[PDB]
Nucleic acid binder design. Structure first.
Length: 577
DNA sequence: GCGATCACGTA
DNA sequence: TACGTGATCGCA
């Protein structure tokens, strides 16, 4: 039983309530709110949004920090409301974030999935109510109102058992003091968006299309015929049947044509270099130029990413529409894409600050490896020092290739890759990659001990934890399949590193947001990308930020080694280098 | 019109 | 390693 309400009564404006502000469109930016449900001690209420959101008492209640609301995915609601000029405050419990902290592997997508964790099944999955894909539609008011009230009732019923388990896990503060405050910061970041210079992007796309026409023509005269270069089946027939290049790698369906294979085939035929070049130009044009231009809002000329705070098993943020975490950087041709990200006001600048080697610093701290801690206490180039140790040479004797291999070993630790993966990145044998690793563990015995100990702890406890008590369950750690078990072992080692680094960055964003307000700066966070925070600010604030931001980031936690922050500012993201 | 599948970019 | 995303193609 629920009141399908016609107007807002005071009964719906209690001190504590479960609240559903339903946004069905996957991209919630400027998206409709289809319905509102409130469950509190006085009953269960469904409100049409046009009513509720025009009611001054309702809107005042939404924005009253002392009126506590329990929700699922409150950022979606907060942002949808921001686009309507309405502030959502007082969200004291977000079930999406609670479920995520309790077990990130569950993939909790909707209220129903979180409710199942506590054997609560009186709510349907969103996909059963709205449908999937083409046939996705908002159902009739009776069906919609039942669904929203059921979601709000589930939230109401589930808050206590979820907070109880969080407390047993010592994750209650992680929820309340880190993830929920971050959610509000991310909602403001997403709402602010980042201004895009679409003229520059369109000019770049114009350039790429011309080179792509040129390289594509050269490819066709080399293949003796025309074909769809973007089809790895057609390309496979041109390279490996017509031109009879060696087959160095097979895929499930046929001939591998990854850039790894093509680089190896380059000496045999001039086509191969042009294919690689076509692949890189086409990646830029399709994915980044055309892809970015599709999601720039023509009103604001901004992109408004959506940060997914509750997806990764490490606690890292992901982002979509656009995904700004893979804007190119390595190749100069691609890094120029970042010239298109500009401050949103005249006489403002982009300020970007990034942790230097935060993952290895976290590893030095957690493993208490004396050699690694000393390397960071001396602020050495970690890759050079790793080369010196592994190859037992002095700094002047480290060749670029020795540093490259040491860097690949460090990369393998940071991202938890296998010996096979290291071998593949170093283009060496698996046996050779293995002996590289062993030489590393002789130089860093503390890291070796941490690796062994964390795997034993994962086996004993069932999970591993980060510095701020995020956990990752690893049921595959006892699997009898070697590849499955090795992956779980590498995740046991890696997640305390990657996840603690994510924890620090999140804490830094919270501290930064409060410091910006304390200092009454106009600067504002725009993006969190890997280990980098990107802000925009009046040019007149750059000198204050140069001092403030690195300090806040460096003081976010106290490790046994310093945190180091590099920072730059400029007129574009590219120039903030 | 989905859904693998392959390839590629940051990690 | 991961996630996100593209184009292709294979199944309807």
């Amino acid at each position: 039983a629920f009141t399908l309400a016609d107007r807002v009564t005071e009964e719906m404006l209690a001190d504590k309530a479960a609240l559903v502000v339903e946004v069905v469109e996957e991209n919630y930016h400027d998206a409709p709110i289809v319905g509102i449900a409130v469950v509190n001690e006085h009953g269960r209420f469904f409100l049409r949004p046009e009513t509720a959101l025009a009611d001054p008492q309702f809107v005042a209640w939404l924005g009253d920090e002392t009126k506590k609301k329990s929700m699922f995915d409150s950022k979606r609601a907060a942002v949808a409301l921001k686009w309507k000029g309405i502030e959502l405050c007082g969200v004291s419990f977000d079930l999406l974030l609670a479920a995520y902290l309790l077990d990130p592997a569950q993939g909790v997508d909707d209220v129903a999935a979180a409710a199942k964790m506590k054997q609560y099944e009186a709510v349907r999955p969103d996909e059963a109510v709205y449908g999937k894909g083409a046939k996705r539609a908002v159902p009739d008011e009776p069906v919609l109102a039942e669904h929203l009230v059921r979601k709000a009732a589930a939230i109401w019923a589930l808050e206590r058992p979820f907070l109880d388990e969080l407390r047993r896990n010592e994750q209650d503060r992680l929820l309340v003091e880190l993830e929920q405050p971050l959610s509000s910061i991310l909602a403001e970041m997403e709402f602010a968006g980042v201004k895009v210079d679409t003229k520059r992007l369109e000019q770049m796309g114009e350039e790429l299309a011309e080179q792509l026409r040129t390289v594509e023509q050269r490819i066709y005269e080399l293949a003796g015929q025309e074909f769809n270069i973007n089809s790895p089946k057609q390309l496979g027939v041109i390279l490996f049947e017509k031109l009879q290049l060696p087959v160095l790698k097979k895929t499930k369906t046929g001939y591998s044509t990854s850039a790894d294979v093509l680089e190896k085939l380059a000496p045999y035929h001039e086509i191969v270099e042009n294919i690689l070049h076509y692949r890189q130009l086409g990646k830029l044009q399709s994915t980044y130029i055309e892809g970015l231009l599709k999601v720039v809002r023509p009103d604001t000329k901004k992109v408004h990413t959506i940060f997914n705070q509750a997806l990764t098993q490490t606690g890292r943020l992901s982002s979509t529409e656009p995904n700004l975490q893979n804007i190119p950087i390595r190749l100069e041709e691609g890094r120029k894409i970042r010239q298109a990200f500009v401050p949103s006001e005249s006489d403002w600048l982009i300020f970007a600050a990034d942790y230097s080697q935060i993952e290895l610093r976290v590893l030095a701290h957690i493993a208490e490896d004396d050699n690694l801690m000393e390397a960071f206490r001396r602020d050495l180039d970690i890759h050079t020092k790793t080369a010196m140790d592994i190859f037992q040479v002095s700094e002047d004797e480290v060749t670029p290739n020795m540093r490259r291999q040491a860097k690949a070993v460090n990369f393998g630790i940071v991202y938890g890759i296998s010996d096979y993966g290291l071998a593949q990145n170093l283009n060496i044998s698996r046996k050779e990659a293995a002996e590289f690793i062993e030489r590393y563990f002789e130089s860093f015995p503390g890291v070796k001990r941490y690796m062994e100990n964390i795997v034993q702890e994962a086996k004993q406890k069932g999970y591993v934890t980060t510095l701020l008590h995020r956990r990752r369950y690893l049921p595959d750690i006892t699997s009898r399949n070697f590849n499955v078990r090795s992956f779980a072992e590498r995740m046991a080692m890696n997640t305390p590193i990657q996840g603690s680094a994510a924890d620090i960055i999140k804490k830094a964003m919270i501290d930064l947001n409060a410091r910006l307000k304390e200092e009454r700066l106009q600067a504002r966070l725009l993006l969190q990308v890997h280990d980098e925070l990107i802000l925009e600010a009046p040019k007149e604030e750059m000198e204050r930020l140069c001092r403030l931001v690195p300090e806040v980031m460096e003081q976010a936690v106290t490790l046994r080694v310093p945190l180091k922050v590099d920072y730059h500012y400029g007129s574009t993201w590219y120039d903030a280098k």
